[PDB]
Design a protein around this ligand. Structure first.
Ligand code: CA
Ligand code: CA
Ligand code: CA
Ligand code: CA
Ligand code: CL
Ligand code: CL
Ligand code: MG
Ligand code: MG
Lengths: 9, 236, 236, 9
């Protein structure tokens, strides 16, 4: 469910 | 716990099946059960634990951001009053997210971190502690927001101190820690200069160590270096 | 039910928020609560109900297919024995899927279908009944598989009979019903010739009625006609 | 969660 948009790993 | 009757190995096997099926809530429950058996986790098992909860909380955070944005629009000048429902449902998602973060932090505190003696495990778990306090910080608004931020900072800092003493600059765990601590500085701590400096120094030190690596390790390290570069390009 | 204390309108409002947040399990629970208020559903509300459960059960079905394929591989010649875990976890997902299908069929039977008097609502709900019996049929393997298949067939057939008498050939509900009944024939009933004949006749009759439509209705109808065409291209 | 792979609507 983790998006791809975030700056984190 | 509902997984108390299942063998540790069976829990790990089903966590891997749940990952293949993209059933990340199941995957997290299976790995929670495995942790609660009380034995330390192998490298592969630590990554399964991280993957599972990253996907669960990642989806909750994405939903929270959607709802928070709708809630903010509703509070602008000229927005029609629609009642308590947006706030209520954002609070519901927020509470569920905080519960998952508290569960992960509870697993780390009882008792993964205290038994973790090797750098690879101790840094891994301290990075997770920083990450899940950072997720709590993203939604915090009250008396404890500063303490939540400082808990994230403290966990990241201990992990950084160990990783710099005990790991090479290209170690993927060290690199992913530095990436996320840099995001903490930029997104949570209002410290964009610190975020940029950390990302740049991490990238440059890793660049200088690539020559020591095999082709496969080079691939692993350069992948995360590219994520540092992407952030620097966005931030500068 | 846990939604018994929430206003009907608030449940509908939160269902729409959950859709925007891609929180389809929440969306389904909200719409279940709305249905249980006992009032009939508007066109928009029926679609919210369908969207919510389609996404919940769609994900369960995708997971079940992943696990069933792993389970089948494990039973081939030369596969190493790995114990009961694959079967157990496929059964877990299967049971959860059957529970969701039973919930939807329960809402239709208590009491959405019996109050639905207009063609647009009655056909909509009977199509849903066919769909959720079809999902049960996909995983059925025992004494009742034939009865589950015939329940799907019977619901689709009643919906088809009404839709042909009461709706134009381009009506999107009629078209989506015919699409899914054709998939039932192909995938469940071992009747690929019936599937192809239904899809082709549905497509051709809709083509001949497009001239009666506005631009917006034409767009709605041709979108579903393309899905019929895609299936015919795959099946022939 | 509904995939795009299925022949149904
Ligand atoms: Ca044991
Ligand atoms: Ca130890
Ligand atoms: Ca009321
Ligand atoms: Ca009625
Ligand atoms: Cl709520
Ligand atoms: Cl299981
Ligand atoms: Mg106004
Ligand atoms: Mg062998």
């Amino acid at each position: 469910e983790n998006p791809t948009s975030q700056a984190s790993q | 716990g509902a997984m108390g009757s299942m063998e540790r190995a069976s829990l790990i096997q089903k966590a891997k099946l749940a990952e293949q099926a993209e059933r990340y809530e199941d995957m997290a429950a299976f790995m929670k059960g495995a942790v609660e058996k009380g034995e330390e986790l192998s490298c592969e098992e630590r990554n399964l634990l991280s993957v599972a909860y990253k996907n669960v909380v990642g989806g909750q955070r994405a939903a929270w951001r959607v709802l928070s944005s709708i809630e903010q629009k509703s509070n602008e000048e000229g927005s029609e009053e629609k009642g308590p429902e947006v706030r209520e449902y954002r609070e519901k998602v927020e509470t569920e997210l905080q519960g998952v973060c508290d569960t992960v932090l509870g697993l780390l505190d009882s008792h993964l971190i205290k038994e973790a003696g090797d750098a690879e495990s101790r840094v891994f778990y301290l990075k997770m502690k920083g990450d899940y306090y950072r997720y709590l910080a993203e939604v915090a608004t009250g008396d404890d927001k500063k303490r939540i931020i400082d808990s994230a900072r403290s966990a990241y800092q201990e992990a950084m101190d160990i990783s710099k003493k005990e790991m090479p600059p290209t170690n993927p765990i060290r690199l992913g820690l530095a990436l996320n601590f840099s995001v903490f500085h930029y997104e949570i701590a209002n410290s964009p200069e610190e975020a940029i400096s950390l990302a740049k120094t991490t990238f440059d030190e890793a660049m200088a160590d690539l020559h020591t690596l095999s082709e496969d390790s080079y691939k692993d390290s350069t992948l995360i270096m590219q994520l540092l570069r992407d952030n620097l390009t966005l931030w500068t």
